[PDB]
Symmetry: C2
Subunit: 106 residues, 2 copies
Amino acid sequence: ADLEDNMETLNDNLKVIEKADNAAQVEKALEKMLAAAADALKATPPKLEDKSPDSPEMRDFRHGFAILMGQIHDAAHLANEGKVKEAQAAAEQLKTTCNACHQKYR
Amino acid sequence: ADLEDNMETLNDNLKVIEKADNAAQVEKALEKMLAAAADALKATPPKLEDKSPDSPEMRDFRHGFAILMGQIHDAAHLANEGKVKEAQAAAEQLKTTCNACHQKYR
Ligand code: HEM
Ligand code: HEM
Ligand SMILES: [Zn+2]
Ligand SMILES: [Zn+2]
Ligand SMILES: [Zn+2]
């Protein structure tokens, strides 16, 4: 998947998490988000097309996913434990990260 | 990249880290390692080449990388602060997460 498709995946699954009945659905949705975030980390977003691979901006971008994958992983543990609404709230607070990178780079 | 190439990148940077001259270099290598761990996440190891991508084995396999990227992440911050030494000792203990996975799965 390219970046836009990976982002849609992060989007489709946050939606699923909000409305899931049970832990297993939340946990799965979260696995799917982890994979997409991971697959997207190597992308070059259109706004940063003209900076070098090793530029502070590109490194910042990559670090944005390291945060995101970190919180996703944590949300995965809560859901894996059976804690549905804590997991759903962990998915909601992830949005800070989505937003802080869209402000800079989308 | 394929899994061999990613593991090569992991091993390689650890040796760049073991003998780095400044914090910048430790940070750069740790970052390269995070990206190679990100990319490897979705590989299927030869040990599980017959297993479904959603088997319990493959799940536990992907967890190993989630854990490893977390620890790389924290090591990256010690590097970034400029605590070169502590970062070098941090990277050395990552080998636990390397061997732990290798022993189950390589
Ligand atoms: C789970 C949290 C996130 C959600 C729900 C999300 C959602 C989205 C959506 C819906 C789009 C529109 C793309 C399309 O039309 O298919 C998009 C674009 C984009 N996102 Fe995210 N995102 C998240 C996290 C992030 C993070 C952490 C970063 C950066 C580190 C990021 C970087 C970008 C960029 C650069 C674009 C523009 C892509 C392009 O035009 O090629 N996103 N995102
Ligand atoms: C910094 C930590 C790690 C280092 C330095 C490392 C290094 C290596 C090396 C040198 C190899 C031999 C393959 C080659 O010749 O390149 C290898 C293979 C392998 N590693 Fe790692 N590894 C690390 C962590 C992990 C983790 C966390 C996992 C799984 C969660 C993993 C899974 C595997 C597998 C499945 C192979 C066999 C692939 C093959 O050679 O066909 N490794 N790794
Ligand atoms: Zn892809
Ligand atoms: Zn960080
Ligand atoms: Zn974990």
